[PDB]
């Protein structure tokens, strides 16, 4: 029977990450279910062992999945991880693509925290999006995890904290729907851009849809140019009309951060915590689902 690491029975495909497909797995020794990411050993741009080293630098951080085993076998580099619960995109679909304000605010607090923690370990994520956050299991069911470090990179030197240099005219790789404006302009990404994408994720949870989502084109890049100029031609005040102003204040703050600015995470988290208490919700971690 098909086994990787001579211990993890391979199951159906359960998604597709960056530079690699994800499979359900079973630990035959424990009976525990796992996630298995595969990368063809003979790729010209190998990544999986880099991503697993980053996962190893990130361990201990709250909401970071554990790495069970990493190796090579057959046609694949193999990375085995802790299996988590549904993704935030899955759960958004589960709730008929509408979240309560309270759930948006509970998620926003935890997602800023995940991102700040990655930043404190000298890395930016660069693919902030609903599929890349997953809820925990059982006793960790109220905890938001961040996954997929296949596009992560150092934004600063690990000993001097010297920030990476500013660059322009980059053909960048991301998720078009959630990318920040600066990425659409070819600018080197940095801490500001993770939090800007979170802000679009928040408005996505709020609306069901984004104004630049579901556009018609033929070619791929000309579908990307249409997303880029609809996103840019949509003022934050018009995207966030009818909603509490904290979502616009959030997005406005992120676009006015400079390339190498350290974000004031505590300010942003406080924006949403203040509205949460003004609304009279209680931080009892009860999400919509």
């Amino acid at each position: 029977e098909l086994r990787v690491g001579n211990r993890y029975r391979l199951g159906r495909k359960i998604g597709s990450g960056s530079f690699g497909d994800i499979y359900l797995g079973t630990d035959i020794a424990a009976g525990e279910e796992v996630a298995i990411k595969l990368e063809c050993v003979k790729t010209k741009h190998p990544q999986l062992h880099i991503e697993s080293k980053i996962y190893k630098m990130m361990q201990g951080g709250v909401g970071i999945p554990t790495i069970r085993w990493c190796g090579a076998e057959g046609d694949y580099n193999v990375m085995v991880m802790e299996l988590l619960g549904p993704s935030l995109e899955d759960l958004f679909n589960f709730c008929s693509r509408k979240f309560s304000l309270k759930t948006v605010l509970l998620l926003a607090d935890q997602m800023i925290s995940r991102i700040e923690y990655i930043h404190s370990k000298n890395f930016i994520h660069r693919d902030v999006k609903p599929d890349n956050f997953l809820m925990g299991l059982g006793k960790k069911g109220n905890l938001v995890y961040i996954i997929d470090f296949g596009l992560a990179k150092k934004y600063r030197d690990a000993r001097t904290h010297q920030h990476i240099p500013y660059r322009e005219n980059k053909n960048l790789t991301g998720t078009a729907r959630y990318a920040s404006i600066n990425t659409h302009l070819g600018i080197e990404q940095s801490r500001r851009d993770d939090l800007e994408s979170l802000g679009y994720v928040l408005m996505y949870f709020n609306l069901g849809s984004l104004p630049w989502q579901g556009l018609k084109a033929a070619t791929k890049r000309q579908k990307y140019e249409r997303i880029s100029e609809k996103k840019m031609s949509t003022p934050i005040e018009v995207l966030c009309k009818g909603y509490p102003s904290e979502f616009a204040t959030y997005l406005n703050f992120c676009r006015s951060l400079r390339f190498d600015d350290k974000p004031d995470y505590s300010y942003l988290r406080q924006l949403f915590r203040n509205l949460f208490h003004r609304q009279g919700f209680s931080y009892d971690y009860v999400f919509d689902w």
């Binding site: 693919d127 599929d131 729907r177 579901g214 556009l215 890049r221």
Partner: peptide, 7 residues
């Protein structure tokens, strides 16, 4: 193509 990883 808007939520696929791409360029």
């Amino acid at each position: 193509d808007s939520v696929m990883l791409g360029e």
